[PDB]
Amino acid sequence: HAHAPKVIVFISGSCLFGAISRSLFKKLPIPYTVVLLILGAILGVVASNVPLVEEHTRDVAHMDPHVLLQIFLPVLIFESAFAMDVHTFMRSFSQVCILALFGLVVASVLTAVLAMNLFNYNWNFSEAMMFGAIMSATDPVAVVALLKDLGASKQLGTIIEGESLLNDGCAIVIFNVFMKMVFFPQLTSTVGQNVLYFLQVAVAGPLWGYAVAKVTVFFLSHIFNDALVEITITLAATYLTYYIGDIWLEVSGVLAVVVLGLIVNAEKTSISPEVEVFLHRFWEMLAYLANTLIFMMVGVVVTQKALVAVDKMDWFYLIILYLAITIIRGMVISLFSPILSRIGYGLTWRNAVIMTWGGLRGAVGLALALVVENLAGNDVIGSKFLFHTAGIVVLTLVINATTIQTLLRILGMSDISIPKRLAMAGAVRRIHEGQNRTLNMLKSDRFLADADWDIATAACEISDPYSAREFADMMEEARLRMLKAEKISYWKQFEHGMLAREALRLLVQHAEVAADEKDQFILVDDLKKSWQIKGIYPWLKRKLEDLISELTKALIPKLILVVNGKINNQLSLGYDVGKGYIIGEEEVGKIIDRMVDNKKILRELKHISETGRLQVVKELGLLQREHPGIAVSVKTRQAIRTILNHSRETIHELQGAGLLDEMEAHKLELTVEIKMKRLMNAPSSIPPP
Amino acid sequence: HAHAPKVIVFISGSCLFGAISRSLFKKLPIPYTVVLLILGAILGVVASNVPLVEEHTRDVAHMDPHVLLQIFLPVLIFESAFAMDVHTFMRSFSQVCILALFGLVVASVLTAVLAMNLFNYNWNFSEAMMFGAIMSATDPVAVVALLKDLGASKQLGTIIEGESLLNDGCAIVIFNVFMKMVFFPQLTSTVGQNVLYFLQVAVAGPLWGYAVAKVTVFFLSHIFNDALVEITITLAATYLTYYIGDIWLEVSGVLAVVVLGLIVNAEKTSISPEVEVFLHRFWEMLAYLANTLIFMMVGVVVTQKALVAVDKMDWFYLIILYLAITIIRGMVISLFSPILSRIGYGLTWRNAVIMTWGGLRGAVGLALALVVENLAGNDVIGSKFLFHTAGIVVLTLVINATTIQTLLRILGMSDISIPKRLAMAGAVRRIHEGQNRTLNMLKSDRFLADADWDIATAACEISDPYSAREFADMMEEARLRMLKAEKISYWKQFEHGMLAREALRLLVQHAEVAADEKDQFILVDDLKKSWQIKGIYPWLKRKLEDLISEKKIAAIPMPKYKLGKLMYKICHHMAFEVTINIAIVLNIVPIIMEFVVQDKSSLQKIEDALRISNYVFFVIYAIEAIVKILGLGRHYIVSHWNKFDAFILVVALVDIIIAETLLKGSITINLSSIKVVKLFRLLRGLRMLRLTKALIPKLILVVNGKINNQLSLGYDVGKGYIIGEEEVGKIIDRMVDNKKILRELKHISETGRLQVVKELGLLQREHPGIAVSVKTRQAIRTILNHSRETIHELQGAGLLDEMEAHKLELTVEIKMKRLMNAPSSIPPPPPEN
């Protein structure tokens, strides 16, 4: 038949409307999403009258809700899940869980009882909770995207995403639970059925996701030098996870997707060094396309069906709703602030204001409102939901995303550190004399003595981006000097092929956490790296439980082996962190004295470094003697890494010098890459000779 | 409504299966596509037996053909076109075109003739051409990978890619043309209709593709620091191009996609490197997915529907068919071997055998066969087509791919040159020396002391993968030594940022062309590099023609009466010309409206609106003319180019006077515009023709830019040659043993160097504009490169955090991109400075 894929013209054409908006409106503070919404609203009026609504451009007007809930939401969730930094997230998971779960529950309940008590169109309990779960899903991408470069503590930058991802994940679960109670009546059930439902939606999801993630990460480490297989495996795995977990067996697919994304992101080492860049870009492109599509459908739908039945009463109600939701978020944050402060980091009074004002609603709420509107057929439900959600989203995008910069400048954390200013000044001045030296060298050239030097001034250089008691002074400068004077050492050794990978981050975070702290020498060894060396946890208690419990009987030895491996991993990591700390402080011990002018603090620093050394020096041997295999295993695994690194730079030196061609060097580099990848998957412990 | 979007899971499973093959049968010489076909054949029967699997495979068993034809084919063709090497393909464009066109036409004709009678099938001639066009589509990817493994000639790979790409592109169009008239006849209308069909399927599509490619390249050239935007505009451009080409406006279709892909691939400079790398990976992934899916449906369909009723003789026919498709194609090459030898690179009988045995069918033919079978309704069409196509594809993949491995070693191109083997042996020996030196360093560590040293054997190094009258020898070995010295010098000049890339690739391919020649050095630039210095294209001649077209008096006589010069300034200001051009552009729409009305209460308005608009435009033109001409007098009549704007006004006045009454007098009721009013309207379309005065300089500057770019490339090539010659003269001076070898080589080098330096000096003297710009560009680009190196050194030294380093980095790349699109011409400085 002459039938054609009518959906191609719209979904692609909409993309173009994004491309103009992103490039043209990037300078203005206002995001392009509101422009996309206005474009969709304008297109809706034209579509209403003219016969331009063919089977295309009109199918989206009555777009099927199940497939959009089944396609858009999983990719929207998984992109943010993949973009996460899992390592820093584990350090505050405990705080984030209590900031997310209870916060979402309380916020949804309060903003539901508000609409139950305020609005005239009477709604029961279920509809109110569906409304609240729709209006309690945030999207603070811009806040972090603009706060990361400001130099603020990365803890806030990761905590914002940690709370937002969990909020979005649980909002869909609550919405789905409370949707079938009103839209799809299925008689009644006893308490046992409810218990089974709760267990299957809360426990089965993450477990299924974890199992699939483990299977795919085990199957991914066995494939060598083939990017296509990795990409195809990941793409098939995520879709299979969601589809099987949601359709064939009734489990929460989105939670399984979240767990799979987090687990895969944690194991990025097994991924090829170049595949993950392509994967990140591809997922980000999908998320951008989905956001553009969702905004345009909202824009076209709202102007025709969602506006016929409104009155000034509702337009007044909208302001009260906005005030209520921002107030509720503020009260939740303030009430939970003492508990957060008591447990670990917490937050100051400054960060709470930004947390409250930094919550921008996103496409998730709009998609849920569209689904609600599509399912319903009357005006009491499906007209208030979409109109209210669109109004709240537009208000937030207009106000908060515009005033966040002024709020930051007022709070004073937008200030640039003076050490950063002087570092930038020195760097630009030295790049200047380097450019001058290069120009001087090019000046005495037989051929290049004729080029006009006006274009040399035109190239110029990147200027400075910023432009614009007797004892308490030298000790602070000494402290901020030693912290990075020791920080540099980890990178210097690692670039030589040292400290594996995890040790670098593990010790740089320990070095920087005490930097913001006042009047305490960093790297105190008080359970900082002692925790990894000890390896104290009930893992061995679980192994003891297995032992007292003990082919089915032969399964227990397999559990014993996996427990042994998981112990040896932590033992090896402790060995690496101890070795790295010792190696770094050995250099800084001779480094410090050259800049330190005052002797009475220089000797204090030397003594405290000696104290930091000898304890960990003894502890390393204490860990070595009990389990001799781990030390020889880690030393052996490090030697091959160093040797392969040296092979790598001699190959690159020959290639750069021109003595080798391109294809032979590429083949040898591929071979050494394969050898190092084979090195990465190695037995945890090697018995001593 | 989407209670179960079951269309997903199967396709995902398909990819899994393919992945498994690529991980399990990698060592096997047979490609994984045979394994995929076996898997599909196995799965088909179990799908038929089990109702649930039949439900899951119902869509595949009933894939509608229209979407398959217009989804997989565009992405496949665009992926094949994108990974192309545009330059080497352009160096043999004529050869590739003639070979592809003639070979495809001849093969299709002979195959149709063969299937006419020998097969004893009840087919007519049109479906015979259908079958011939289906079978003659190839995709030699695996064989090309095999050739590139052992380092076959890059030119051979370029030819075997170009021929295949053009073959598929033309075969798809021929198949569509001879399918539409067969399955859905539209009878006959007019020979002119046939001519219009030929024109719309031949020329329109390439022009549409070129237009969209130019537009998207221009739009992309201005986007800075946005990867997602570039990726999405590229994807949308390709999809919209194919969509508008195939349906709505009716053109060739895939030809437009081919042109767009080639143009985009050639202008990859304006695309940021990460963007093009990501696009390459994405397109090849899509192609792999499409191939996997196509083989999946081929297996399923040949399992359930096809093969049901096949007699014993059909397989016999299959064998015969194979021989045909392995003979005629080869003879075609021979029948064009004497001619193609005279064209470009020529060829050799060994290469003739290679491309004769290197013709492998693939996904395109199977997809077309599947479309035919889906649109079929009986057994003589579709079932036989599927069976024969699958047989030929499987036979080719099994036989040709396996046999060419023996063929290459039995002819002798798989040999490894002993200089390469000795160089690799020395390289791995020195690498092993580095390994043992590192082990010696690290075996005495205060910490890494108890590590077991047996793992050194684990480190090891790759053993050589190859494993296994006196004048002429020193001449040839010395010549090869000079050649390698040259190319390593050029690579050094590049990595230090001194030679760009186009000059490098051109001159190194000249180098290896001289290398394969018999005792021939790079030789003096008689035309090998002198051509790059002489812009002997007709472009400059056309520039002279444009200049004489634009020839006019620099300053018209200055009026003095009444306002005088100010009035002349009114009649010669750029604002007045811009206003006249804008008036012409705005009245062009009235011409379109009048034409639409003539070709056709709605008409009541147009009965007078067109006349009113025409009168207003005529009055505006008369006022503009009154603004000019005054004071010039005879100078107004002297300027014939300017006077050409008065004939349109005279014609408009005559038409207005005639149409005022048309009954009172003048034309009256004679044979005139009274009979047909189009004569009044058609003349009104001439006013838009008085606009080339400002358009000519645009193409003048375009040609100037083209010739300046050619001059810049020539200067870069000369710089590279002279620098490499100096370095080699300073390096080899003591390497050469025989005094006479040194004398001959140094004399040849001296002749070349002191010829090329004088040629470059003459070029600089005659046209100082381009050389200065080239020097400035090279200086600033090397300055930026060294600044980037210093920034990277600072990052390595940890003086700055990595995020500030990245900020300075992308600022440097922004400056570099601003450098790339800078004009290639710089005015000379005044002598005072």
Numbering used by the authors:
A (entry chain A): 71 to 538, 573 to 654, 813 to 951
B (entry chain B): 71 to 538, 573 to 704, 723 to 955
What did the authors write?
SLC9C1 belongs to the NHE family of ion transporters, which facilitate the electroneutral exchange of cations (Na+/Li+/K+) and protons (H+) across membranes to regulate intracellular pH, sodium levels and cell volume. Rather than containing a partially disordered cytoplasmic tail, it contains four additional TM helices that form an S1–S4 voltage-sensing domain (VSD), and a distal cyclic-nucleotide-binding domain (CNBD)2,4. SLC9C1 is therefore an essential component of the pH–sAC–cAMP signalling pathway in metazoa, required for sperm motility and fertilization.
To understand the molecular basis of cAMP regulation, we determined the cryo-EM structure of SLC9C1 in the presence of cAMP, which was built into the EM maps reconstructed to 3.6 Å. Consistent with SLC9C1 being inactive at 0 mV, we observed no structural differences in the NHE transporter module. The CNBDs could not be modelled, with either absent or poor map features for the CNBDs at lower contour levels, and this decreased the size of the modelled cytoplasmic interface. The movement of the ICH3–ICH6 helices in the presence of cAMP is propagated to the VSD domains and increases their mobility. As such, cryo-EM map density for only one of the VSD domains was observed and at a lower local resolution of about 3.5 to 6.5 Å resolution. The detachment of ICH7 from the transporter module is clearly correlated with the repositioning of S4 and the VSD. Thus, it appears that cAMP has primed SLC9C1 for activation by detaching CNBD interactions with the cytoplasmic end of S4. However, the binding of cAMP to the CNBDs, appears to make it easier for the S4 helix to move downwards by (1) destabilizing S4–CNBD interactions; (2) weakening homodimerization contacts; and (3) partially detaching ICH7 and rearranging S1–S3 to facilitate S4 movement.
